[PDB]
């Protein structure tokens, strides 16, 4: 995808993440765990439902039209009736093919983007207290217990509290 996260610096997806589309796994002094990220998951779901609802909205209603099957050879007028219909069908078939190609390219890119946005947001919270290991994981350079991990996950992590400890570990 365009952002290089999904099938990129994130090496693979997690079959064990069964309660969200995007999320976190951690290891700290209290063990390991996993949690779905609700906001990123819902942003992707909401965009996908948005495009689905635009696509499946409003079939056209048509009533009396032209005949499209014929039991006798007639020549010129029938030739034209059949050509008009064949022309119409080929144009709609082209629209249908192109629509799903464009939509699908974009769905892959928007989901890749949501992964990348979560990663960047997490990085920004951590400031100088962590480093990007290059595989979608952050090495956090301070003791970070379950409540600390949850503070990152819920967006209230206070980098200043841990900065002295982390810098000592990173740089000295």
């Amino acid at each position: 995808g365009l952002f290089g996260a999904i099938a990129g610096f994130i090496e693979n997806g997690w079959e064990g993440m069964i309660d969200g589309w995007y999320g976190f796994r951690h290891q700290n002094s209290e063990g390991t765990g996993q949690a779905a990220d609700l906001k990123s998951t819902q942003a992707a779901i909401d965009q996908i439902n948005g495009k689905l609802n635009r696509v499946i909205e409003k079939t056209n209603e048509k009533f009396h039209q032209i005949e499209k099957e014929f039991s006798e050879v007639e020549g010129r007028i029938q030739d034209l009736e059949k050509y008009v219909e064949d022309t119409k069908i080929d144009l709609w078939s082209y629209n249908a093919e192109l629509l799903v190609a464009l939509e699908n390219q974009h769905t892959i890119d928007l989901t890749d983007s949501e992964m990348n946005k979560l990663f960047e947001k997490t990085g920004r919270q951590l400031r100088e207290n962590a480093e990007d290991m290059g595989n979608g994981c952050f090495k956090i350079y301070h003791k970070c217990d379950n409540a600390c991990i949850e503070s990152i996950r819920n967006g209230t992590y206070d980098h200043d509290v841990y900065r002295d400890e982390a810098l000592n570990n990173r740089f000295q």
Partner: antibody, heavy 119, light 109 residues
Framework: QVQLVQSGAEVKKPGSSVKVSCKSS????????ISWVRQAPGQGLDWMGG????????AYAQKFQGRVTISADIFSNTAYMELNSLTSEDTAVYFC??????????????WGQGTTVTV | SALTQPPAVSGTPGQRVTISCSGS????????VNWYQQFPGTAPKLLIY???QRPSVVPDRFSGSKSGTSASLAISGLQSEDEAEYYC???????????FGGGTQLTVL
């Protein structure tokens, strides 16, 4: 402002099945989880399960697993609950309710009017 | 069950009333609590979510809190229109499903 509108009251004989619908009007609910919650006469609320149809999740309460089928039609903006092998223990009002987001943890903030099923 | 509430609470107009909700580690302990209000024959209404968060349409006299494996709904300044059934709720990680308390009937004296 979305409203959830449920199908009408049902009278059922023992062993039969009932399928209740929940239509999201005034907007779609396809990007949210909708749960089904029942309330037996004089009793409390009881979760049956839910569905989040774009996300692709259907969940069931263990106590109803195998007897209930929850489904959705994203094109008509409708969710469904089908409960099989009915007995008098299933006489209850059945509600559909939409969660604040795509999954079942969030508070249920939009509720249907309820559907009475009498067995 | 799973969550346990007193069957009944009462108060006078203007009084402060509290409704307790006892759970376990698999629900209230590790998950967020929601509270619902229900008038007879009508659908429940969301009153509190995420433990202490209040929807904009819900009066500020309603508040919620969570400590340990317990939760509490407080109604400051009780009004007559608050006579209703109240339910606590949370996800349970052991049952892998949503659970509710048995409900508390609030009577305005």
């Amino acid at each position: 402002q979305v409203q959830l509108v449920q199908s009408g009251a049902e009278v059922k004989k023992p062993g039969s099945s009932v399928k209740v619908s929940c239509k999201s009007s005034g907007g779609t609910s396809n990007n949210y989880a909708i749960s089904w919650v029942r309330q037996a006469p004089g009793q409390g609320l009881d979760w049956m399960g839910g569905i989040s149809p774009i996300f692709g999740s259907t969940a069931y309460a263990q106590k109803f697993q195998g007897r209930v089928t929850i489904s959705a039609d994203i094109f008509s903006n409708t969710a469904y609950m089908e409960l099989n092998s009915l007995t008098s223990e299933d006489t209850a009002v059945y509600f559909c309710a939409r969660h604040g987001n795509y999954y079942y943890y969030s508070g249920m903030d939009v509720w249907g009017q309820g559907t009475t099923v009498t067995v | 069950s799973a969550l346990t509430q007193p069957p009944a609470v009462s108060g006078t107009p203007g009084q402060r009333v509290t409704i307790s909700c006892s759970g376990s580690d698999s629900n209230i302990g590790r998950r967020s609590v929601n509270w619902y209000q229900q008038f007879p024959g009508t659908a429940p209404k969301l009153l509190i979510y995420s433990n202490d968060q209040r929807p904009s349409v819900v009066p500020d006299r309603f508040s919620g809190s969570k400590s340990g494996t317990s939760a509490s709904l407080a109604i400051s300044g009780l009004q007559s229109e608050d006579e209703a059934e109240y339910y606590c709720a949370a996800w349970d990680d052991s049952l892998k499903g949503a659970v509710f308390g048995g409900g508390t009937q609030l009577t305005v004296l």
